[PDB]
């Protein structure tokens, strides 16, 4: 949401998952995003709808995206002797999507 | 108890229709029960006169009780003659009377609403006037008479009231309100006059 510089009221503008609605969203270096930035795609990747309730703007956008993300194992090399959960920093709620 | 709550001190509209159906009406028979000079079972009823029924001659107007006229009109064996007050000219005259005298009701028969409903439902093809106009004038009379009633229910004292020329169905529907508001305004008065 942003304060419109001309009309001076809060307005809602979409991001990557809205510009890619009914398309594909490509997230290179998935494991290097901040956790509090990576958790923001949990709803739009399963429910396929972005819910915003900021600055008095209560609305639920629609984002029918299809995330394709490229990750990188811990340490730079995939250790085949360890399970998957021990090779990545991602958790179950984001790995299950 | 024996008598249900909604039948305590009033008549259900079905009972009003029952009362109205006992009034004589004039019909044109489509059969002929008049025995010739040259068997057959006679009516011999106990709550009315069977004389006009054993002497029916086709297309010769007689008068029979309304609940029998309807019974014959269930088949094609009679033709109910609409009363003279149920014509467009007379309904217009009554409407003009109502619009001219805003203090008193017109002299319509006590069963005008019930009779109009019954004849419109069961004898819809026996009117010399278009029924779509008779309905529109019956409704107009009902509306004017409802306006006059609501402006007289503004005179609900505790002594009495004169609802002259009011019909039977209108009185029946106004009974539980008038007769229960006047009772309270009488109880208040008698409580005050306890000296």
């Amino acid at each position: 949401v942003r304060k419109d510089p001309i009309t001076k009221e809060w307005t809602l503008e979409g991001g990557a998952l809205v510009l890619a609605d009914k398309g594909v969203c490509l997230i290179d270096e998935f494991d290097k995003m901040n956790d509090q930035d990576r958790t923001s795609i949990h709803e739009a990747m399963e429910q396929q709808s972005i819910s915003i309730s900021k600055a008095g703007i209560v609305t639920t956008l629609q984002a029918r995206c299809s995330i394709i993300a490229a990750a990188n194992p811990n340490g730079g090399r995939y250790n085949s002797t360890l399970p998957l959960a021990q090779n990545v920093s991602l958790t179950e709620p984001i790995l299950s999507r | 108890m024996s008598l249900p709550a909604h039948l305590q001190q009033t008549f259900s509209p079905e009972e009003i229709q029952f009362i109205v159906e006992n009034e004589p009406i004039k019909i044109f028979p489509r059969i002929t029960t008049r025995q010739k000079i040259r068997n057959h079972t006679r009516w011999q009823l106990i709550t009315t006169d069977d004389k006009a029924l054993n002497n029916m001659v086709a297309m010769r107007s007689t008068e029979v009780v309304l609940w029998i006229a309807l019974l014959l009109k269930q088949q094609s064996k009679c033709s109910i003659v609409a009363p003279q007050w149920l014509t467009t000219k007379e309904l217009d005259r009554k409407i003009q009377y109502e619009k001219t005298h805003p203090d008193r009701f017109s002299e319509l028969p006590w069963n005008w609403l019930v009779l109009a409903r019954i004849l419109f439902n069961k004898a819809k093809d026996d009117f010399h006037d278009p029924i779509h106009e008779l309905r529109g004038k019956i409704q107009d009379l009902r509306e004017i008479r409802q306006i006059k009633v609501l402006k007289g229910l503004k005179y609900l004292n505790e002594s009495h009231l004169q609802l002259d020329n009011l019909s039977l169905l209108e009185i029946n529907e106004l009974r539980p309100f008038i007769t229960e508001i006047m009772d309270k305004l009488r109880e208040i008065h008698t409580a005050s006059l306890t000296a």
Binding site: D21, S40, H42, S51, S53, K54, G56, I57, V58, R64 | -
Partner: protein, 484 residues
């Protein structure tokens, strides 16, 4: 415009509209309406050439949630549908009908559906003579492993409830949840704009992804959940708004899965203060049971292969389910008609059960030597009271008998006591296991009084029962070595 009708990658579009005379004060923000109007044109002087601002002049509004207030703060229910509701309330299986019709596509989760029914009906509000008021709304928290259909339940509750707001924990700020002070572009004067907890007033707000909220945003719900008022002192404004909303929040324990190896307090990052507001705190788990997995798979496949559109319709027409448009009306009618109050026999049961619950929590805390993450407080006694009153309310019973108390106690034991009962000295346990393994033979049994003489809480016997090496059979009076 409807969120399901916006084109691809487009923001929803607004449209100025004008009511007049008897079509005014007919709708409230957030309600979905169908309008019959004249798409007209007016040239507001507020940036092209010969442009004209469009608007619709309303000639008829057909909401589906009643007028201002609920049914205009009274009952606008046609006589035939009121009689239908009365006939419905006398159904001996009304509780099962309501439970079976809450998200019919979600297999299992019977207890959560029952708690959702109680949340939708809500308790009975009280206003004491001395001034303080007691809230009558139920807050439910749904913790558990991912993939357990918590968000689907929240989305369904957002539909069935007459007034509901669906928000996600991530994309939601404190000033956007309760009330936002905004500056009028024309008059330069500050004013409030209601948030999610004001739009959902008189209904339920579903906060999905609860644990993702910023720590300074989740605090703003503390007053609006218990006191049910929003206090604002900003920019020269000083008001105490009203938010009589039930909060149905779905969260996620840290590490995604519950990870019962870790302590129960480690999985839940919510403070005790926030956890105390919630009346029922469900912790669901993935059982990984083959017989249940087959049932879930066969149900989901039937959902996908068009079989739902036939089976659900057949069940609804059979009378074992209620359509959304009918349950919504019934919920509104029950909330505006009945506010049950406890009978003295019910109150005695509630008190004697609260004492038991607190004693159990005390002994668990003493054994673990650490405060329980899930708290049991007087607010939970009021939670059981509200659940009892909602159970009575759905039957339109003016007084809550002991049946409702028994069911409310069962619901609380199935949700909050279950959440609080999760468990991860050791030398004593090892000594006990070794001595009973060597002394008690593999195929025989010994009575428990004898083991007590040998000696505590003796959780070692329960642990061994988990390992299937012993087995308590004769009503707990006989400990039998099962064969391990």
């Amino acid at each position: 415009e409807i969120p399901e009708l916006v084109p691809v990658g487009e923001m929803p579009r607004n449209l100025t509209m004008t009511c007049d005379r008897y079509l005014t004060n007919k709708v409230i923000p957030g309600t979905r309406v169908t309008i019959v109007g004249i798409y007209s044109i007016y040239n507001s002087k507020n940036s092209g050439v010969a442009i004209r601002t469009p608007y619709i002049k309303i000639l008829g509004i057909q909401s589906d949630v009643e007028t201002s207030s609920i049914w205009n703060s009274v009952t606008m229910f046609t006589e035939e549908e009121e009689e239908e509701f009365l006939q419905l309330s006398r159904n001996p299986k009304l509780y099962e009908i309501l439970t079976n019709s809450i998200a019919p596509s979600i297999f299992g989760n019977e207890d959560i559906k029952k708690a959702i029914v109680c949340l939708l009906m809500g308790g009975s509000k009280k206003i004491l003579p001395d001034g303080m008021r007691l809230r009558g709304d139920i807050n439910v928290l749904l913790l558990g492993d991912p993939g357990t259909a918590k968000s689907q339940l929240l989305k369904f509750v957002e539909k069935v409830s007459p007034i509901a707001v669906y928000t996600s924990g991530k994309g939601s700020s404190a000033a956007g949840l309760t009330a936002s002070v905004q500056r009028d572009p024309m008059t330069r004067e500050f004013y409030l704009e209601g948030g999610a907890m004001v739009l959902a007033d008189g209904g339920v707000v579903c906060i999905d992804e609860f644990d993702k909220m910023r720590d300074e945003d989740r605090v703003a719900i503390h007053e609006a959940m218990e006191q049910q008022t929003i206090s604002i002192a900003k920019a020269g404004i000083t008001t105490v708004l009203n938010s009589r909303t039930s909060v149905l929040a779905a969260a996620n324990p840290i590490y995604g899965r519950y990870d019962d190896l870790k302590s129960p307090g480690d999985n839940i990052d919510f403070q005790t203060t926030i956890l105390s507001r919630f009346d029922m705190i469900f912790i669901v788990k993935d059982d990984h049971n083959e017989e249940r997995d087959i049932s879930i798979a066969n149900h989901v496949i039937n959902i996908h292969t068009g079989n739902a559109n036939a089976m659900q319709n057949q069940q609804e027409e059979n009378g074992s389910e209620i359509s959304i448009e009918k349950m919504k009306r019934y919920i509104t009618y029950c909330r505006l008609k009945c506010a049950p109050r406890l009978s003295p026999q019910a109150a005695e049961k509630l008190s004697s059960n609260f004492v038991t619950i607190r004693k159990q929590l005390l002994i668990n805390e003493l054994e673990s030597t650490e405060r329980s993450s899930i708290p049991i407080t007087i607010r939970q006694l009021e939670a059981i009271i509200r659940i009892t009153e909602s159970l009575a309310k759905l039957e339109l019973s003016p007084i809550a008998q002991e049946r409702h108390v028994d069911e409310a106690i069962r619901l609380f034991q199935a949700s909050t006591m279950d959440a609080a009962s999760q468990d991860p000295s050791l030398s004593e346990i090892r000594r006990f296991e070794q001595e009973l393994k060597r002394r008690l033979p593999i195929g025989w049994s010994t009575s428990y009084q004898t083991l007590r003489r040998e000696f505590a809480l003796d959780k070692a016997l329960y642990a061994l029962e988990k390992h299937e090496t012993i087995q308590l059979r004769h009503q707990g009076q006989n400990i039998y070595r099962s064969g391990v």
